[PDB]
Design a protein around this ligand. Structure first.
Ligand SMILES: CCCCCCCCCCCCCC(=O)SCCNC(=O)CCNC(=O)[C@H](O)C(C)(C)COP(=O)(O)OP(=O)(O)OC[C@H]1O[C@@H](n2cnc3c(N)ncnc32)[C@H](O)[C@@H]1OP(=O)(O)O
Ligand SMILES: CCCCCCCCCCCCCC(=O)O
Lengths: 339, 337
């Protein structure tokens, strides 16, 4: 069913950004605005369910964060950069409109003049898009190894959003529109993929399915210093698209929820995740969450969670792992890894 | 090499307003005299006499959508046949969502349609073609759209502001001069499985080489681009030369056996230096930078579209696509008409 054959995960790593910014600290700054607007509940901690997120230093570029994750992934795969035939950067954050962030990461790492490099961008689903693009090359044997890399920077969005929200003249509409920006987090991930013949004991990536609802492309719009979001509609329409995607997953992947061992789900908030889980009858014990302390790390979130599961010893040979995400667009992808 | 991939349709959009270099020079003149500049670098050296700008508030997605509708017409298919849409432009108005999702919503793609952006300076359209080719070959989709709209209005407005500020120095001038060689435009291409379109040109793919140590040489956002023009020409030509040598082995290329060269459009001296390297007949190399400037990753398919519309290509004609982009990355591929 066009599922990938002989494509494996040779190496995986994540980077947690070092600086903790608490929702309590945020609420401190926003309190005069809350009081003016008559907001009496903690919409960050109690409603969204986010208690903290991580930020980098101000001088860290997306390419820097991605470079860090990539070096750690190369070590996990026990290979040198000279073996990499393809490097794709999947992040929402970017250094410049041009050149690609991939070219910057590739120069930092010292790839060879045979290495193919470029960025893919697609909100929170891009890492999975990157894995599929690499998989198609690896399956046909065009390359032996690929790197998929992703660094996210939320520093500037916090800095400018907080300034706008605490201005004496901010409107209730603008405040509500920008609030979800304060659920984002910094972080990075990278994966080394390989032809299975080279790594017979490595986990296998099978791919999976994708569905879209691009008529909803206005729901969440972001730039370096601003994100505007219709949270209510994003939930309702996101969930509808996921159910459609699940029907497809059952068809091509043969999925039955009680037969899956882990669900690695992109997270936009605690209620969004709860609605998702309840929708498909998923065992909550099978769903790791880092949103509470890391917020939403965009397209890095899924591979960060998978890396964290690996490091926690939660994954064992033969485990069936579902990668699931809804991304601004809207887009929804569901794929399988067999550990 | 790709065996079962074809180009079902192709289209370009020329932007409607002309900004001549003569007119730029009139604005720049007091800066020129204050700095003792006696040369017309744009006109006499770069050989860019004009470029096109959009009406105000045309966004990248708008330009790309215009081109896509035209390319669907050229392919004789409705949007419901498209299983994949990739946007490859440098211009974008948001980091999220993809500019592809916005174009896709404009066009009304189906809920089965996979969409996303590829970014790779001026090489991204060829990258997007190759990504679509692999999906077509593998049987995942029947038809793909690759789209690209570029918006240079802002970069011109802000760059001309800076170059006329009374403080401006000659080094600042030289550092931003390359931004005055850019232009607006758009292109889109429909790719398909060959069994569906037997008379259509075949896309064979090609080879890719990189020189990623040179990533600092040209850096740009919507309002500003800085460029080391001298080193970029020298290193860009080195990499183009290496990739062309590689193309000679794996594609079997010999210069006298290719009918058209479709080159990324950078400047007269860039172009001249490449074709002299390999003794390429300049008559086999269509150029539009003279009046359109550098339209980034859309430059190559805009040229290909213009050749198609000129209507003088014939079946069996071997067409070399020579793409390159700030990075540096280079890719060369073959279409057989
Ligand atoms: C970023 C997003 C924006 C929005 C989207 C946009 C579109 C899509 C995106 C596209 C993405 C874009 C991505 C990209 O990558 S675009 C980057 C590649 N493009 C360019 O570099 C632009 C064109 N550059 C050239 O054509 C050549 O380098 C020039 C013509 C400059 C020199 O060529 P050449 O080597 O043959 O000339 P020469 O050395 O013998 O000098 C002769 C004369 O010229 C004078 N001179 C030389 N250099 C400069 C200078 N820098 N400033 C001022 N003057 C200069 C010099 O003083 C001398 O004068 P005179 O003494 O004899 O008095
Ligand atoms: C294969 C193209 C041959 C033309 C020679 C161009 C010289 C290299 C300069 C490349 C500059 C980057 C171009 C871009 O991203 O717009």
């Amino acid at each position: 069913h066009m599922l990938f054959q002989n494509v494996s995960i040779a190496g995986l790593a994540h980077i947690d950004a070092p600086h903790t910014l608490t929702s309590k600290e945020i609420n401190e700054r926003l309190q005069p605005t809350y009081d003016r607007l008559g907001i009496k509940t903690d919409v960050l901690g109690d409603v969204a369910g986010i208690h903290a997120r991580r930020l980098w230093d101000q001088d860290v570029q997306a390419s820097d964060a991605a470079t860090q994750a990539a070096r750690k992934a190369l070590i996990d795969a026990n290979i040198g950069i000279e073996k990499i035939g393809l490097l794709i950067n999947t992040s929402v954050s970017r250094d410049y409109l041009e050149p690609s962030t991939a070219s910057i990461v590739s120069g930092n790492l010292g790839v060879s003049d045979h290495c193919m490099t470029f960025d893919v961008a697609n909100a929170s689903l891009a890492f999975i898009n990157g894995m599929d693009i690499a998989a198609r090359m690896l399956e046909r044997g065009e390359i032996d190894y690929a790197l998929v890399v992703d660094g996210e920077t939320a520093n500037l969005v916090y800095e400018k959003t907080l300034e706008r929200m605490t201005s004496p003249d901010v409107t209730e509409e603008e405040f509500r529109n920008e609030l979800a920006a304060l659920t984002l987090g910094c972080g990075a991930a990278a994966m080394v993929m390989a032809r299975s013949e080279l790594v017979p004991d490595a986990p296998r990536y099978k791919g999976g399915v994708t569905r879209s609802a691009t008529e909803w492309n206005k729901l969440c719009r972001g730039n370096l210093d601003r994100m505007v979001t219709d949270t209510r509609l994003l939930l309702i329409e996101g969930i509808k698209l996921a159910q459609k995607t699940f029907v497809a997953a059952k068809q091509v992947l043969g999925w039955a929820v009680e037969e899956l061992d882990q669900f690695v789900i992109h997270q936009v908030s605690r209620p969004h995740t709860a609605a998702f889980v309840k929708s498909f009858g998923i065992d909550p014990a099978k769903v790791m969450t880092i949103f509470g302390e890391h917020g939403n790390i965009g397209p890095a979130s899924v591979p960060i969670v998978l890396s964290k599961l690996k490091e926690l010893g939660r994954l064992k040979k033969g485990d069936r792992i579902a990668l699931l995400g809804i991304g601004s667009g809207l887009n929804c992808s569901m794929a399988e890894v067999v550990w």
